[PDB]
C-alpha cells in the first residue's frame, strides 16, 4: 500500500485518495475508547490541546477533567497505530507569533510583497531554534489554495515512523493528526508566490527532543543512567558545595557572581572556593543530548513586582506588552541556573507566572544533581555560571487552580547559548 509521493504538492486528488484508503483501515483497528476520542478531537481539538498544556504545567495533585484525560491518552495510542512508512510533507499557514517574531513580514508599500529587511530578520530568528509544538497537531496534505491572510506558509516534513493519522469528517479535505511531543526545526526559508501574493515559506523537519514533562519515571532513569557515574566521581569538596548550594546556600553565591558583593559574614576567598568547586563539578559531565528544562521565575528577573500592574497577565494588553519587550532578546546569566526536568508546577513557587522552558544543548556544562539521594524528588539540573539564553517564544495559558493563582501564565521558550 501507501502508493504516494513524499509531497503531494498541489495534487489534492491523489492525496484525498490515499487519505481515504488508509483512514478506513485505520478506523477499523481502533478500540471503542479510541474511536470516541478521535470523534472528540474532530469536534473540539482546541480545548483538548489547551487542556494538554494546563495539565502538564499543573501541580502534582491536579485531578483535571476525567474525559479529557482519557482523550489525551487515547488519541496518542490511536495515532501510533498509523505510523508513516516514509517521509510525508504537510502544509499549514501560520502567524508570525507562532515563531516568536514581532516584525511584520508583509511590506507596508505593497501588501502582495514580503519586506526584504523583515525576511532577513526572520531567517536569523528561526535559526538555531527548536519550536516546541504543544498538544496534538492537525494539518493538511497539499499546498492549500485559500487566499490566506497569514504571512507564513509552513512546509513540514514528517519523518518515517511518525504517528500521523488520516482522519476528519470532510471526505474531500481529510486531515493529518500528528501525535504530541514534537518540535519544529527550520530547514529553509524562501519567498513564494501563491495567487499573486508573496508568503514566507518555512521548510521544517518534525523532530523529537528529550522532554519528560510529567513522566517522573523516565526522568529519574535518565538522570541516574547519565549522572550516577558523575556523582560517584565528585570530590568531597564538590559534593559538599553542591549539596550546600542546592539546600539553600545559593543566595550569597549568586549575589557575588552577579555584582561581586561579599556578605559581612564571609570573604571573597570563601565565596570563590565555593564557586570554583561547584563550577568544576558542572564541567565534569556535559549534557549528553538536547533536553528541555524548566524554571518558575521570579517577577524581578524581568523588572516586575508581585503587585506591579504589568504583572497582571489576566489583561491581554499586559501579555502583549511583555511579548514586545522580551521576544527575541538574549539574557546573560552570570549566576548558576537551577532548572528542573519536569514541567509540573511546584508547591514552593506555585503562584509565579513566568515559566522558563529552556532548551539545554548537547554539550552544555550542567549536571542532573538530583542523583544525590537528598534531591531525588526535586529532579533538578544545575547549569554552570556565565551562559546566556535567547527568548524564542512566549505562550500564554490559564492556570485555573487556586494554589496556582487563578491567573494567566506565560511559557517562555528559550535556548541556552
Going from N- to C-terminal start, the domains of the chain cover: 1-210, 211-417
Residue in this structure with the C-alpha cell 558583593, named with its chain if needed = 261
The cell numbers describing 111, all together, are 501588501
Other C-beta atoms closer than 10 Å to the C-beta of 58 total 20
Superfamily (CATH) of domain 211-417: Toxin ADP-ribosyltransferase; Chain A, domain 1 (3.90.176.10)
Residue 144's DSSP bridge partners are: none
Does residue 335 have a known ligand-binding role?
A: yes
Does residue 285 have a known ligand-binding role?
A: no
Does residue 106 have a known ligand-binding role?
A: no
The cell numbers describing 91, all together, are 502544509
Among residues 9, 182, 175, 32, the alpha carbon closest in space to that of 89 is found at 9
In order of 129, 230, 386, the CA distances from 124 in angstroms are: 10, 36, 23
Sign of CA dihedral 393, 394, 399, 403: positive
Does residue 240 have a known ligand-binding role?
A: no
Q: Judging by beta carbons within 10 Å of its beta carbon (0-12, 13-18, 19+), is residue 348 exposed, middle or buried?
A: exposed
Does residue 74 have a known ligand-binding role?
A: no
Resolution (A): 1.9
Does residue 196 have a known ligand-binding role?
A: no
The cell numbers describing 405, all together, are 493563582
In the CATH hierarchy, which fold is given to the domain comprising 1-210?
Answer: Toxin ADP-ribosyltransferase; Chain A, domain 1 (3.90.176)
Angle (nearest 5°) at CA 65 between 62 and 70: 110
Common-topology check for domains 1-210 and 211-417: yes
Does residue 352 have a known ligand-binding role?
A: yes
Amino acid at each position: 500500500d501507501d502508493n504516494r509521493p513524499m509531497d503531494f504538492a498541489k495534487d489534492k486528488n491523489s492525496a484525498t485518495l490515499w487519505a481515504k484508503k488508509r483512514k478506513q483501515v485505520w478506523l477499523n483497528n481502533l478500540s471503542k475508547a479510541e474511536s470516541t476520542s478521535i470523534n472528540n478531537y474532530i469536534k473540539n481539538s482546541s480545548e483538548i490541546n489547551s487542556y494538554s498544556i494546563k495539565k502538564k504545567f499543573a501541580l502534582d495533585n491536579y485531578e483535571g477533567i476525567e474525559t479529557l484525560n482519557e482523550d489525551l491518552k487515547n488519541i496518542s495510542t490511536a495515532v501510533k497505530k498509523s505510523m508513516l512508512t516514509k517521509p510525508l510533507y504537510v502544509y499549514y499557514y501560520e502567524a508570525n507569533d507562532k515563531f516568536g517574531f514581532n516584525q511584520n513580514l508583509e511590506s507596508s508599500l505593497d501588501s502582495n510583497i514580503i519586506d526584504e529587511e523583515a525576511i532577513n530578520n526572520f531567517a536569523k530568528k528561526i535559526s538555531d531554534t527548536n519550536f516546541i509544538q504543544d498538544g496534538f497537531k492537525d494539518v493538511t496534505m497539499t499546498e492549500p489554495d485559500i487566499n490566506s491572510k497569514l504571512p507564513i506558509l509552513v512546509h513540514l516534513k514528517l519523518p518515517t515512523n511518525t504517528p500521523a493519522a488520516s482522519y476528519g469528517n470532510d471526505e474531500e479535505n481529510l486531515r493529518v493528526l500528528i501525535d504530541q511531543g514534537y518540535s519544529l526545526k527550520a530547514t529553509g526559508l524562501s519567498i513564494v508566490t501563491i495567487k499573486g501574493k508573496q508568503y514566507a515559506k518555512v521548510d521544517a523537519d518534525l523532530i523529537k527532543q528529550l522532554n519528560f514533562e510529567n513522566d517522573v519515571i523516565s526522568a529519574s532513569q535518565w538522570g541516574e543512567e547519565n549522572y550516577a557515574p558523575w556523582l560517584k566521581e565528585l570530590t568531597s569538596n564538590e559534593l559538599r558545595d553542591i549539596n550546600n548550594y542546592l539546600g539553600g546556600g545559593y543566595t550569597a553565591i549568586n549575589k557575588y557572581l552577579l555584582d561581586g558583593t561579599i556578605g559581612e559574614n564571609t570573604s571573597k576567598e570563601d565565596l570563590e572556593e565555593k564557586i570554583s568547586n561547584i563550577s568544576s563539578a558542572l564541567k565534569k559531565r556535559k549534557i549528553p543530548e538536547d533536553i528541555i528544562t524548566y524554571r518558575r521565575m521570579g517577577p524581578n528577573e524581568f523588572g516586575l513586582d508581585l503587585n506591579s500592574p504589568d504583572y497582571d497577565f489576566n489583561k491581554v494588553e499586559n501579555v502583549s506588552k511583555f511579548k514586545e519587550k522580551w521576544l527575541g532578546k538574549t539574557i546573560p546569566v552570570k549566576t548558576f541556573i537551577s532548572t528542573t526536568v519536569l514541567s509540573n508546577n511546584i508547591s514552593a513557587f506555585a503562584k509565579r507566572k513566568l515559566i522558563l522552558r529552556l532548551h539545554l544543548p548537547n554539550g552544555s556544562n550542567a549536571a542532573y544533581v538530583s542523583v544525590a539521594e537528598g534531591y531525588k524528588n526535586e529532579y533538578e539540573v544545575l547549569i554552570d555560571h556565565g551562559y546566556s539564553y535567547k527568548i524564542d517564544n512566549i505562550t500564554e495559558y490559564y492556570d485555573e487552580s487556586s494554589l496556582g493563582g487563578k491567573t494567566n501564565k506565560l511559557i517562555i521558550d528559550a535556548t541556552l547559548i
